[PDB]
């Protein structure tokens, strides 16, 4: 997790200001009043968890399926924007009519030189993909994907009444995707919708051509409708010359929505009553995270009012459509009440009783089991591979994670984190300007870390507010998405609490008063200073969502919070291949234990191995790291290094002996935290394996030199706890979770303190 | 437990110096060399645990039985010395021959005016005790005891062939007694032996008179042997005019033993080869705790050489006998090897590796169950009472103590106490002159606290060395015995380790060179400074036993260590009465819980009650407090207040910020100690009762005022742990253990720190 001050926050982390999204640049705080009331449809969203595997290649074909696939592909960062995927796709099937030969040759597969026409059909369907790999020689395909696409028309079932088999399909694993959207994500949505406008007609045409085909004869003679097949689809491809223009339409519905927001009356911003109605927008005004997307792209690209729309006809064609009313996005529009709620609340009491520890937190049970893949490549001799799930490290390590599936529950974490509770004297005097604002989400880490980037750098970029901006455009991307997902998540969750919101320019640089933020209100909070407001008027009135967050009364989490976890043995006997890599290849790696007693080096040196007790190596497998399982413990890692370096900065600053007592107790209580945690980690059964076996090895080392064979001399007290960590080290790296540069940290922190048991055991 | 410095100790606690026993008065350290080699019979001792109930009144009669009873009586402090009991006893049966009427009247019970003689015997034996209570009107008996004694002669069985029944006996509960002896204890022994010289003849005479009695007739006619009965016993009472003189004989065998010790050759101190032999003394020289008794009474009364002995004949009559060869003492002579061993060892390591934490400790499982008495007084309408054991608070509280019978095992205590381990920086630098000398015994507390005095005052008197000497002669007594039992225990245990010892005057005030101490030696210790010696010569050479203690290698405890625990339901259907009181009368007492939330006083106020769930009051019972069960936790209490006030004195003295860090971690780790201890105490089933029920009561208090009835508002986090202590409070007072003026301390210490969970939970 992670925390801020309650009074200050901009001096703690600029990223959660509305102002930073507004690009206010650290200076003046937003406050400007003169307000317009709102309401909630609790706003459009995504899913949150959707780990599943589509079938393709079975010849059913449905654009909504592929839309997810390309969308996920960009979410894999396989190229970049979906829009790029699409323009490059059209660049691909600019091999459109310039290649009649696609028909002439696939029909040649139908056998062929079909001027020798007849009810020729016999058998063969399901792998034109290879003869179409010859079509890849005809249609080179640096991407696997569209090459894997085009097969379908000839072989969805065509000719639907024979050809014939498949008895086989294909594969891909969509994972859960991004939680909340943005400019690029949206244009990717509507772009995916132009593709939606593509493929469905592309199926329907053939769907009727087949009706007009088997005139009988039987399937009738070729070099015709077959030789047709998709020429009409090419015309359908030419029906696709003009959907819209994604950035323009998105910017359009955007800024017109903003005009619907802004106080600014005049003709530049006068949403016509001629069209203030007309469906959709009437609830679409209510969406609010979508509104965050507004202020976001308003932040990046100014406003750039192309206003492709008129005032009414047609201010209709442009908002004919948008992403939620697309199914093309994994993301989906959202009903009324729950918003996206699933976080409880508690708050510190000094019997006064203003909070000093805000408690806002997670809600999430991590995977109970994970399974290794055996990369049995054989077909194609390239990317094509089979994984064949089988038990291995799997079952046993999983059962060992079950206790971790208890003792590292988030509820227990925050509950202990809440137990930090009493601090700076007593009791009853803990208050002093700011107060800690602890928080964190399952999502931001589960995704940004899934991209393999280490979220904490972005987190710190938020903490300083200002972007490091030295990153690769890829990392530039992960940073951006990190930002608006943090921010917006906090926004619309905070919104999920407080019922009412009002629009607020800002002013400052105006830059034409279109720039704007929000201010909120609640009353129940006790007459105490809190944030800039205090509470002022018996009511909040704050720009800043965190402020409304702090005042909220304690509650409970709602969502099923489960990791759901994938399975695939079915699809595995089916596979085939897909962009899978990221796992990656060789399931684990050794870590080397060491210790000294009687002033002698020993170095236990253990692998990897199954370690569990059946050799050897194994080999080969690789298991996926759960995003979640490492993400959560990384939240805590962020806490560890947080209290470490920051309160060490306190060790540097306030040299007051009482403040000395504070840094003492706090750093040494995170110390007792990881202490007792690894402590319970050592009792784990694999931990038991590491204990007995590594101890067996170094006892064998005792037998090395003949005089230090004088029985065990390690065991007294300190050594046991001292090696107890080693169990937490196997549980660390190559348990499939922690990423090293970690035990590193833990080592230094375990050096920071006396540790000991500290008692128990 | 309790601790000292390793280098210093006289500046830490003078009481464990040999010198304090020598009355050196703080100044010069003993060291004087010129030495005489010794050996061990591992020395005479006592038992250590002997909780059992003698039968009397059944008419068997055996002086060895009564010897224990009087001895225990003085150990109850019922009067004072056993010698006092005996001289006052003879003062009692100075009603000896001046009362022929005891015969004339008991025979009158035989019916009587026996000049009307015949084989009169019919029936009636077993309660002359009441008609002898009329003899108490004849022989007033401020003590119950001798009155309860004299009955026996007429009614051991006399006349042995009728009279007749008893079908009933009597009672007394001997407990375990003092571990090790001293001057007064010894003279009490030999005095008990003159009583031994008394009663056995007192039985034997009648034992033959009966043989010469029932001449038949049948039992023959009275006013004769009956009228005789004990006149010969009075002559036997007159055989008892002169055993010896206890103080003189004890002083004799004493100082002659000392002459056997001292280097001083000349005629005043030249143990005759004429009698250096002659049994007993040949192994008696080897006894060494007995030798502590030597240096002790040599300390109190100078030497005062009456030398009732000559040089040989008879230097025999005086050591004809002594206490171990008496059975009169509960104490008993001891064989070869074990001495009285039952303590393990460990020591702190800095990989150098001199100890910084000596670990010397206990070994003792406390009672698993205890049972209340119902004081059903009815007979005599005075001291006479029946207890009738029945289940009550008993069974259930006991089962609740079973977890305490796990989590407050001494082994776990010292093991956590050993975990204090790392301290003052790292690692590897913990060393700095002195080092903690943690220690304590089951015995000293189990007994001195059994006397109801609070041992810790005596402990502190030892810590300062110098006696407070303001105590009542009773308390003067408990102080003395506390001293020599501590001291000697440590002595002969330390002796139980090191094989060899040599005699050492001292010198100083000489006072005639008879004053003397001991110096010891071991070699294995590493070349490091330790105590005054360092190690000097590759060998120890120290006067002071603790020094030899510290160097010893780690080991394990041996003894059965069990509390054995009394039972009595049998004897209960039998009882009768004995000096029982001390329990005392009404089994328990209420403690009042209180808490504030929403700024309102609540005050849970709970009794007592069974509390367990069946009323009411009950009443009446009283249960014995185990000596042990409270004694041990009192050891820890001594530790609590120890680290508290002493390291608080460190808070006063060394204001160094690092030393600030040290006082921080140590005081706050005792804090975490009692924290986690009461923490696990709260999960106890009676603790569960206190939780749910007191919570039920204050929730009922919520229903008091109608608006604070707004459901529970206590439960968040801090309150639960905050009331978790209350379970440890019921477990405290009137669990039958802790004595209050205790939670007092705990309260202040729980105020000392943040506490919190500190985590968990």
mmCIF file of N, CA, C and O in Angstrom, chain A residues 346-347 349 351 415-416 418-422 426-427 597-600 655 657-658 660-661 664-665 669 676-677 716 718 722 751 753-761, chain B residues 346-347 349 351 415-416 418-422 426-427 597-600 655 657-658 660-661 664-665 669 676-677 716 718 722 751 753-761, unseen atoms left out:
data_model
loop_
_atom_site.group_PDB
_atom_site.id
_atom_site.type_symbol
_atom_site.label_atom_id
_atom_site.label_comp_id
_atom_site.label_asym_id
_atom_site.label_seq_id
_atom_site.Cartn_x
_atom_site.Cartn_y
_atom_site.Cartn_z
ATOM 1 N N UNK A 346 -12.067 2.076 7.853
ATOM 2 C CA UNK A 346 -11.960 2.338 9.287
ATOM 3 C C UNK A 346 -11.133 3.612 9.426
ATOM 4 O O UNK A 346 -10.622 4.133 8.437
ATOM 5 N N UNK A 347 -11.036 4.146 10.640
ATOM 6 C CA UNK A 347 -10.242 5.347 10.861
ATOM 7 C C UNK A 347 -9.755 5.461 12.297
ATOM 8 O O UNK A 347 -10.409 4.997 13.232
ATOM 9 N N UNK A 349 -8.779 6.647 15.983
ATOM 10 C CA UNK A 349 -9.525 7.350 17.014
ATOM 11 C C UNK A 349 -8.583 7.812 18.128
ATOM 12 O O UNK A 349 -7.698 7.074 18.559
ATOM 13 N N UNK A 351 -10.277 9.523 20.612
ATOM 14 C CA UNK A 351 -11.444 9.937 21.380
ATOM 15 C C UNK A 351 -11.643 11.442 21.235
ATOM 16 O O UNK A 351 -11.763 12.171 22.220
ATOM 17 N N UNK A 415 -5.590 -4.656 8.645
ATOM 18 C CA UNK A 415 -5.956 -4.717 10.050
ATOM 19 C C UNK A 415 -4.717 -4.535 10.914
ATOM 20 O O UNK A 415 -4.746 -3.801 11.902
ATOM 21 N N UNK A 416 -3.622 -5.180 10.530
ATOM 22 C CA UNK A 416 -2.362 -4.936 11.218
ATOM 23 C C UNK A 416 -1.851 -3.538 10.927
ATOM 24 O O UNK A 416 -1.221 -2.903 11.765
ATOM 25 N N UNK A 418 -3.699 -1.044 10.414
ATOM 26 C CA UNK A 418 -4.503 -0.180 11.265
ATOM 27 C C UNK A 418 -3.990 -0.199 12.692
ATOM 28 O O UNK A 418 -4.219 0.736 13.454
ATOM 29 N N UNK A 419 -3.284 -1.264 13.042
ATOM 30 C CA UNK A 419 -2.784 -1.437 14.397
ATOM 31 C C UNK A 419 -1.567 -0.562 14.637
ATOM 32 O O UNK A 419 -1.090 -0.454 15.763
ATOM 33 N N UNK A 420 -1.061 0.056 13.573
ATOM 34 C CA UNK A 420 -0.020 1.057 13.718
ATOM 35 C C UNK A 420 -0.602 2.130 14.602
ATOM 36 O O UNK A 420 0.096 2.724 15.418
ATOM 37 N N UNK A 421 -1.903 2.338 14.419
ATOM 38 C CA UNK A 421 -2.793 2.978 15.376
ATOM 39 C C UNK A 421 -2.140 4.038 16.271
ATOM 40 O O UNK A 421 -1.967 5.186 15.858
ATOM 41 N N UNK A 422 -1.791 3.657 17.494
ATOM 42 C CA UNK A 422 -1.167 4.576 18.436
ATOM 43 C C UNK A 422 0.223 4.983 17.972
ATOM 44 O O UNK A 422 1.028 4.145 17.574
ATOM 45 N N UNK A 426 0.776 10.048 23.325
ATOM 46 C CA UNK A 426 -0.478 9.476 23.786
ATOM 47 C C UNK A 426 -1.416 10.634 24.129
ATOM 48 O O UNK A 426 -0.963 11.630 24.689
ATOM 49 N N UNK A 427 -2.708 10.530 23.824
ATOM 50 C CA UNK A 427 -3.321 9.339 23.247
ATOM 51 C C UNK A 427 -3.794 9.483 21.787
ATOM 52 O O UNK A 427 -3.456 8.630 20.972
ATOM 53 N N UNK A 597 29.410 -20.093 11.556
ATOM 54 C CA UNK A 597 29.475 -20.406 12.971
ATOM 55 C C UNK A 597 30.863 -20.963 13.213
ATOM 56 O O UNK A 597 31.478 -21.512 12.296
ATOM 57 N N UNK A 598 31.364 -20.785 14.433
ATOM 58 C CA UNK A 598 32.739 -21.137 14.773
ATOM 59 C C UNK A 598 33.684 -20.427 13.807
ATOM 60 O O UNK A 598 34.753 -20.935 13.471
ATOM 61 N N UNK A 599 33.254 -19.244 13.370
ATOM 62 C CA UNK A 599 33.993 -18.405 12.433
ATOM 63 C C UNK A 599 34.377 -19.125 11.142
ATOM 64 O O UNK A 599 35.523 -19.044 10.707
ATOM 65 N N UNK A 600 33.423 -19.824 10.529
ATOM 66 C CA UNK A 600 33.700 -20.533 9.281
ATOM 67 C C UNK A 600 32.594 -20.395 8.238
ATOM 68 O O UNK A 600 31.414 -20.561 8.544
ATOM 69 N N UNK A 655 15.708 15.588 14.612
ATOM 70 C CA UNK A 655 16.648 14.878 15.470
ATOM 71 C C UNK A 655 16.121 14.849 16.913
ATOM 72 O O UNK A 655 16.790 14.366 17.832
ATOM 73 N N UNK A 657 14.552 13.801 20.242
ATOM 74 C CA UNK A 657 14.682 12.507 20.891
ATOM 75 C C UNK A 657 13.339 11.790 20.973
ATOM 76 O O UNK A 657 13.278 10.563 20.948
ATOM 77 N N UNK A 658 12.264 12.558 21.082
ATOM 78 C CA UNK A 658 10.934 11.978 21.021
ATOM 79 C C UNK A 658 10.672 11.482 19.607
ATOM 80 O O UNK A 658 10.113 10.403 19.400
ATOM 81 N N UNK A 660 12.985 10.709 17.701
ATOM 82 C CA UNK A 660 13.858 9.549 17.691
ATOM 83 C C UNK A 660 13.085 8.325 18.151
ATOM 84 O O UNK A 660 13.223 7.240 17.588
ATOM 85 N N UNK A 661 12.259 8.506 19.174
ATOM 86 C CA UNK A 661 11.480 7.398 19.699
ATOM 87 C C UNK A 661 10.458 6.954 18.657
ATOM 88 O O UNK A 661 10.152 5.764 18.532
ATOM 89 N N UNK A 664 12.122 5.177 15.842
ATOM 90 C CA UNK A 664 12.502 3.934 16.480
ATOM 91 C C UNK A 664 11.361 2.951 16.337
ATOM 92 O O UNK A 664 11.472 1.941 15.636
ATOM 93 N N UNK A 665 10.244 3.286 16.963
ATOM 94 C CA UNK A 665 9.137 2.362 17.013
ATOM 95 C C UNK A 665 8.563 2.034 15.657
ATOM 96 O O UNK A 665 8.197 0.895 15.416
ATOM 97 N N UNK A 669 8.916 -1.395 13.844
ATOM 98 C CA UNK A 669 7.659 -2.138 13.808
ATOM 99 C C UNK A 669 7.364 -2.631 12.397
ATOM 100 O O UNK A 669 6.688 -3.642 12.225
ATOM 101 N N UNK A 676 7.778 -11.141 11.800
ATOM 102 C CA UNK A 676 6.770 -12.140 12.122
ATOM 103 C C UNK A 676 6.199 -12.769 10.854
ATOM 104 O O UNK A 676 5.782 -13.928 10.860
ATOM 105 N N UNK A 677 6.204 -12.015 9.761
ATOM 106 C CA UNK A 677 5.693 -12.553 8.507
ATOM 107 C C UNK A 677 6.562 -13.672 7.972
ATOM 108 O O UNK A 677 6.076 -14.770 7.725
ATOM 109 N N UNK A 716 21.215 -23.070 18.809
ATOM 110 C CA UNK A 716 21.140 -22.500 20.147
ATOM 111 C C UNK A 716 19.840 -21.717 20.199
ATOM 112 O O UNK A 716 18.879 -22.116 20.858
ATOM 113 N N UNK A 718 19.615 -18.037 18.002
ATOM 114 C CA UNK A 718 19.626 -17.033 16.946
ATOM 115 C C UNK A 718 19.684 -17.658 15.560
ATOM 116 O O UNK A 718 19.061 -17.156 14.629
ATOM 117 N N UNK A 722 17.492 -17.103 12.160
ATOM 118 C CA UNK A 722 18.394 -16.531 11.168
ATOM 119 C C UNK A 722 18.312 -17.267 9.841
ATOM 120 O O UNK A 722 18.627 -16.716 8.791
ATOM 121 N N UNK A 751 19.122 -6.369 8.595
ATOM 122 C CA UNK A 751 20.327 -5.918 9.257
ATOM 123 C C UNK A 751 20.070 -4.677 10.084
ATOM 124 O O UNK A 751 20.848 -4.324 10.970
ATOM 125 N N UNK A 753 17.879 -4.099 12.275
ATOM 126 C CA UNK A 753 17.390 -4.282 13.630
ATOM 127 C C UNK A 753 17.912 -5.526 14.310
ATOM 128 O O UNK A 753 18.521 -6.393 13.690
ATOM 129 N N UNK A 754 17.641 -5.593 15.607
ATOM 130 C CA UNK A 754 18.015 -6.716 16.441
ATOM 131 C C UNK A 754 17.349 -7.974 15.934
ATOM 132 O O UNK A 754 17.865 -9.078 16.102
ATOM 133 N N UNK A 755 16.187 -7.781 15.321
ATOM 134 C CA UNK A 755 15.352 -8.881 14.886
ATOM 135 C C UNK A 755 15.042 -9.798 16.059
ATOM 136 O O UNK A 755 14.062 -9.596 16.776
ATOM 137 N N UNK A 756 15.907 -10.791 16.252
ATOM 138 C CA UNK A 756 15.672 -11.905 17.169
ATOM 139 C C UNK A 756 14.339 -12.545 16.771
ATOM 140 O O UNK A 756 13.901 -12.402 15.630
ATOM 141 N N UNK A 757 13.681 -13.237 17.690
ATOM 142 C CA UNK A 757 12.427 -13.893 17.378
ATOM 143 C C UNK A 757 11.242 -13.071 16.874
ATOM 144 O O UNK A 757 10.467 -13.619 16.097
ATOM 145 N N UNK A 758 11.044 -11.814 17.290
ATOM 146 C CA UNK A 758 11.804 -11.129 18.328
ATOM 147 C C UNK A 758 11.586 -11.877 19.631
ATOM 148 O O UNK A 758 12.467 -11.961 20.479
ATOM 149 N N UNK A 759 10.397 -12.457 19.736
ATOM 150 C CA UNK A 759 10.101 -13.537 20.664
ATOM 151 C C UNK A 759 9.242 -14.487 19.831
ATOM 152 O O UNK A 759 8.613 -14.043 18.871
ATOM 153 N N UNK A 760 9.236 -15.775 20.182
ATOM 154 C CA UNK A 760 8.611 -16.838 19.383
ATOM 155 C C UNK A 760 9.407 -17.042 18.097
ATOM 156 O O UNK A 760 9.646 -16.094 17.353
ATOM 157 N N UNK A 761 9.838 -18.277 17.847
ATOM 158 C CA UNK A 761 9.610 -19.393 18.758
ATOM 159 N N UNK B 346 22.645 -22.128 28.381
ATOM 160 C CA UNK B 346 23.019 -21.594 27.072
ATOM 161 C C UNK B 346 23.753 -20.285 27.341
ATOM 162 O O UNK B 346 23.828 -19.837 28.483
ATOM 163 N N UNK B 347 24.338 -19.692 26.305
ATOM 164 C CA UNK B 347 25.037 -18.424 26.474
ATOM 165 C C UNK B 347 25.102 -17.624 25.182
ATOM 166 O O UNK B 347 25.137 -18.184 24.086
ATOM 167 N N UNK B 349 26.177 -15.419 22.032
ATOM 168 C CA UNK B 349 27.284 -15.525 21.095
ATOM 169 C C UNK B 349 27.392 -14.251 20.255
ATOM 170 O O UNK B 349 26.389 -13.706 19.794
ATOM 171 N N UNK B 351 30.024 -14.409 18.016
ATOM 172 C CA UNK B 351 31.044 -15.068 17.209
ATOM 173 C C UNK B 351 32.427 -14.615 17.664
ATOM 174 O O UNK B 351 33.252 -14.175 16.863
ATOM 175 N N UNK B 415 13.827 -19.267 26.977
ATOM 176 C CA UNK B 415 14.141 -19.293 25.559
ATOM 177 C C UNK B 415 13.830 -17.939 24.937
ATOM 178 O O UNK B 415 14.617 -17.418 24.148
ATOM 179 N N UNK B 416 12.697 -17.357 25.311
ATOM 180 C CA UNK B 416 12.406 -15.997 24.876
ATOM 181 C C UNK B 416 13.340 -15.006 25.545
ATOM 182 O O UNK B 416 13.708 -13.990 24.967
ATOM 183 N N UNK B 418 16.314 -15.637 26.352
ATOM 184 C CA UNK B 418 17.564 -15.765 25.617
ATOM 185 C C UNK B 418 17.500 -15.002 24.308
ATOM 186 O O UNK B 418 18.527 -14.618 23.754
ATOM 187 N N UNK B 419 16.287 -14.776 23.826
ATOM 188 C CA UNK B 419 16.086 -14.109 22.548
ATOM 189 C C UNK B 419 16.303 -12.612 22.683
ATOM 190 O O UNK B 419 16.324 -11.894 21.688
ATOM 191 N N UNK B 420 16.454 -12.143 23.918
ATOM 192 C CA UNK B 420 16.850 -10.766 24.148
ATOM 193 C C UNK B 420 18.181 -10.601 23.461
ATOM 194 O O UNK B 420 18.479 -9.548 22.905
ATOM 195 N N UNK B 421 18.954 -11.682 23.505
ATOM 196 C CA UNK B 421 20.064 -11.959 22.606
ATOM 197 C C UNK B 421 20.799 -10.723 22.073
ATOM 198 O O UNK B 421 21.658 -10.163 22.755
ATOM 199 N N UNK B 422 20.470 -10.309 20.855
ATOM 200 C CA UNK B 422 21.103 -9.149 20.242
ATOM 201 C C UNK B 422 20.734 -7.868 20.972
ATOM 202 O O UNK B 422 19.569 -7.625 21.276
ATOM 203 N N UNK B 426 25.612 -3.951 17.037
ATOM 204 C CA UNK B 426 25.772 -5.187 16.291
ATOM 205 C C UNK B 426 27.271 -5.418 16.094
ATOM 206 O O UNK B 426 27.999 -4.460 15.843
ATOM 207 N N UNK B 427 27.752 -6.656 16.187
ATOM 208 C CA UNK B 427 26.927 -7.842 16.389
ATOM 209 C C UNK B 427 27.076 -8.522 17.764
ATOM 210 O O UNK B 427 26.061 -8.787 18.403
ATOM 211 N N UNK B 597 -15.796 5.065 25.471
ATOM 212 C CA UNK B 597 -15.905 5.306 24.045
ATOM 213 C C UNK B 597 -17.014 6.324 23.875
ATOM 214 O O UNK B 597 -17.909 6.410 24.719
ATOM 215 N N UNK B 598 -16.930 7.115 22.808
ATOM 216 C CA UNK B 598 -17.841 8.233 22.590
ATOM 217 C C UNK B 598 -17.804 9.147 23.812
ATOM 218 O O UNK B 598 -18.798 9.777 24.167
ATOM 219 N N UNK B 599 -16.632 9.192 24.443
ATOM 220 C CA UNK B 599 -16.381 9.990 25.638
ATOM 221 C C UNK B 599 -17.367 9.715 26.772
ATOM 222 O O UNK B 599 -17.899 10.648 27.367
ATOM 223 N N UNK B 600 -17.607 8.440 27.073
ATOM 224 C CA UNK B 600 -18.525 8.086 28.154
ATOM 225 C C UNK B 600 -18.025 6.948 29.039
ATOM 226 O O UNK B 600 -17.567 5.919 28.544
ATOM 227 N N UNK B 655 22.152 9.485 28.746
ATOM 228 C CA UNK B 655 21.206 10.186 27.887
ATOM 229 C C UNK B 655 21.629 10.042 26.417
ATOM 230 O O UNK B 655 21.018 10.621 25.513
ATOM 231 N N UNK B 657 21.919 8.975 22.754
ATOM 232 C CA UNK B 657 20.821 8.668 21.852
ATOM 233 C C UNK B 657 20.845 7.205 21.426
ATOM 234 O O UNK B 657 19.803 6.607 21.163
ATOM 235 N N UNK B 658 22.038 6.631 21.348
ATOM 236 C CA UNK B 658 22.156 5.206 21.092
ATOM 237 C C UNK B 658 21.655 4.440 22.306
ATOM 238 O O UNK B 658 20.953 3.433 22.185
ATOM 239 N N UNK B 660 19.624 5.680 24.287
ATOM 240 C CA UNK B 660 18.200 5.928 24.152
ATOM 241 C C UNK B 660 17.565 4.824 23.325
ATOM 242 O O UNK B 660 16.479 4.340 23.641
ATOM 243 N N UNK B 661 18.255 4.417 22.266
ATOM 244 C CA UNK B 661 17.732 3.373 21.401
ATOM 245 C C UNK B 661 17.688 2.053 22.165
ATOM 246 O O UNK B 661 16.781 1.236 21.973
ATOM 247 N N UNK B 664 14.967 2.081 24.704
ATOM 248 C CA UNK B 664 13.794 2.012 23.858
ATOM 249 C C UNK B 664 13.460 0.556 23.616
ATOM 250 O O UNK B 664 12.433 0.051 24.079
ATOM 251 N N UNK B 665 14.367 -0.126 22.936
ATOM 252 C CA UNK B 665 14.096 -1.482 22.525
ATOM 253 C C UNK B 665 13.896 -2.433 23.680
ATOM 254 O O UNK B 665 13.046 -3.306 23.604
ATOM 255 N N UNK B 669 10.497 -4.041 24.698
ATOM 256 C CA UNK B 669 10.443 -5.468 24.391
ATOM 257 C C UNK B 669 9.960 -6.262 25.598
ATOM 258 O O UNK B 669 9.378 -7.331 25.442
ATOM 259 N N UNK B 676 2.281 -9.767 24.298
ATOM 260 C CA UNK B 676 1.935 -11.009 23.623
ATOM 261 C C UNK B 676 1.484 -12.069 24.624
ATOM 262 O O UNK B 676 0.675 -12.939 24.298
ATOM 263 N N UNK B 677 1.987 -11.982 25.850
ATOM 264 C CA UNK B 677 1.590 -12.947 26.867
ATOM 265 C C UNK B 677 0.131 -12.804 27.248
ATOM 266 O O UNK B 677 -0.627 -13.764 27.170
ATOM 267 N N UNK B 716 -13.503 -1.720 16.677
ATOM 268 C CA UNK B 716 -12.788 -1.231 15.506
ATOM 269 C C UNK B 716 -11.483 -2.006 15.455
ATOM 270 O O UNK B 716 -11.284 -2.867 14.597
ATOM 271 N N UNK B 718 -8.478 -1.088 18.378
ATOM 272 C CA UNK B 718 -7.755 -0.878 19.626
ATOM 273 C C UNK B 718 -8.517 -1.416 20.829
ATOM 274 O O UNK B 718 -7.911 -1.950 21.755
ATOM 275 N N UNK B 722 -7.462 -3.851 23.932
ATOM 276 C CA UNK B 722 -7.527 -3.041 25.142
ATOM 277 C C UNK B 722 -8.311 -3.736 26.243
ATOM 278 O O UNK B 722 -8.125 -3.459 27.424
ATOM 279 N N UNK B 751 0.612 1.462 30.030
ATOM 280 C CA UNK B 751 0.523 2.858 29.659
ATOM 281 C C UNK B 751 1.838 3.367 29.109
ATOM 282 O O UNK B 751 1.897 4.398 28.442
ATOM 283 N N UNK B 753 3.680 2.212 26.827
ATOM 284 C CA UNK B 753 3.939 2.015 25.411
ATOM 285 C C UNK B 753 2.703 2.077 24.545
ATOM 286 O O UNK B 753 1.575 2.085 25.030
ATOM 287 N N UNK B 754 2.952 2.107 23.242
ATOM 288 C CA UNK B 754 1.912 2.129 22.234
ATOM 289 C C UNK B 754 1.064 0.883 22.347
ATOM 290 O O UNK B 754 -0.117 0.886 22.004
ATOM 291 N N UNK B 755 1.699 -0.182 22.821
ATOM 292 C CA UNK B 755 1.079 -1.489 22.877
ATOM 293 C C UNK B 755 0.589 -1.894 21.495
ATOM 294 O O UNK B 755 1.328 -2.495 20.715
ATOM 295 N N UNK B 756 -0.658 -1.533 21.202
ATOM 296 C CA UNK B 756 -1.389 -2.017 20.033
ATOM 297 C C UNK B 756 -1.369 -3.549 20.088
ATOM 298 O O UNK B 756 -1.193 -4.125 21.160
ATOM 299 N N UNK B 757 -1.532 -4.215 18.954
ATOM 300 C CA UNK B 757 -1.551 -5.664 18.934
ATOM 301 C C UNK B 757 -0.344 -6.449 19.444
ATOM 302 O O UNK B 757 -0.559 -7.539 19.963
ATOM 303 N N UNK B 758 0.901 -5.975 19.301
ATOM 304 C CA UNK B 758 1.279 -4.778 18.560
ATOM 305 C C UNK B 758 0.910 -5.000 17.105
ATOM 306 O O UNK B 758 0.536 -4.078 16.389
ATOM 307 N N UNK B 759 0.985 -6.264 16.708
ATOM 308 C CA UNK B 759 0.313 -6.784 15.527
ATOM 309 C C UNK B 759 -0.220 -8.138 15.997
ATOM 310 O O UNK B 759 0.332 -8.708 16.936
ATOM 311 N N UNK B 760 -1.289 -8.627 15.365
ATOM 312 C CA UNK B 760 -2.027 -9.818 15.808
ATOM 313 C C UNK B 760 -2.759 -9.508 17.111
ATOM 314 O O UNK B 760 -2.149 -9.053 18.076
ATOM 315 N N UNK B 761 -4.071 -9.731 17.131
ATOM 316 C CA UNK B 761 -4.809 -10.212 15.967
#
